[PDB]
């Protein structure tokens, strides 16, 4: 009776003293902001509770090689361009498949890149596009990678730590002030900073490689968002990304579906009010991908069964 008021003080003082997300119970409904960065999965857009990625903020984004990673990134650019935005990729891995970007929803045409030297060229790089207040994304692929100049120089251990630091502490504010957001991509360094500035922290992993027929069309991945001041944290999300595709929105819009209860089962068969979507999750993602109309019906069912 007592205690839940002056619990409900106790939370106030915190996000009063520490800003909004401070503390929250798990069975929180999160708050919603106006605009932010769909992922590509819907699945993943509601692991991150706000329906994307949020704006004005830092992220990670860590896994193995070959984990998707990247792949999850690039659709975060896509989406960002898709609304009219411009996209940044500082670049220490040079590693990047701009055919695969296009196929998956990337302006690359649009799209700055940047190579830098050195660890500290790249962030501040990364400050000054931030500071124009003319992007919504930029990429750093990937930290690791992020060589100290004295390193490069030849020339002071635990450096990298250092530099992160520093940096971080002042692109903070930019992006704050900006609204931009920046993804810093993270292999498995100065991700010991990164991890406390970060607001949104996902673990990418490739569980098992999807069987076409007889060859591997691509492969299910499984994101944990281990970090989230904007939600609720330690939801996780599984979709699909395809060879030389990216990641089937149309497949998670199906799995959401199912979840949800907007998509029912007549065995194999999945439905979608009375009428049949198809037998088997290929044709179903195929009927999806053939007919938008539907796809955005439940894509927008989905949403409003939950923000």
Not at 43 to 64: C, F, M
Not at 202 to 218: F, H, P, S, Y
Request: aromatic share 4%; charged share 25%.
């Amino acid at each position: 009776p007592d205690r839940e008021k002056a619990l409900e003080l106790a939370v106030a003082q915190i996000e009063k003293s520490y800003g909004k997300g401070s503390v929250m119970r798990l069975g929180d409904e999160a708050r919603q902001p106006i605009s932010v960065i769909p992922t590509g999965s819907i699945a993943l857009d509601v692991a991150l509770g706000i329906g994307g990625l949020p704006r004005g903020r830092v992220i990670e984004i860590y896994g193995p090689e070959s984990s998707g990673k990247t792949t999850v990134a690039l659709h975060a650019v896509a989406n960002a361009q898709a609304a009219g935005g411009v996209a940044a990729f500082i670049d220490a891995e040079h590693a990047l498949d701009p055919d695969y970007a296009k196929k998956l929803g990337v302006d690359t045409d649009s799209l700055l890149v940047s190579q830098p030297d050195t660890g500290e060229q790249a962030l501040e790089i990364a400050d000054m596009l931030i500071r124009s207040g003319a992007l919504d994304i930029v990429v750093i692929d990937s930290v690791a990678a992020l060589v100290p100049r004295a390193e490069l120089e030849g020339e002071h251990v635990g450096l990298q730590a250092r530099l992160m630091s520093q940096a971080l502490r002042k692109m903070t504010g930019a992006l704050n002030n900006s609204g931009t957001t920046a993804i810093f991509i993270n292999q498995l360094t100065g991700g010991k900073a990164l991890k406390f500035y970060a607001s949104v922290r996902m673990d990418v992993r490739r569980v098992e490689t999807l069987k076409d027929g007889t060859n591997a069309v691509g492969n299910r991945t499984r994101v944990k968002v281990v970090k989230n001041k904007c939600s609720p944290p330690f939801k996780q999300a599984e979709f699909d990304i395809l060879y030389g595709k990216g990641i089937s929105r149309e497949g998670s819009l199906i799995d959401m579906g199912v979840d949800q209860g907007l998509i029912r089962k007549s065995g194999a068969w999945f439905t979608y009010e009375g009428e049949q979507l198809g037998q088997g999750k290929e044709n179903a993602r195929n009927f999806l991908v053939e007919n938008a109309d539907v796809a955005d019906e439940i894509e927008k069912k989905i949403k409003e069964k939950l923000g």
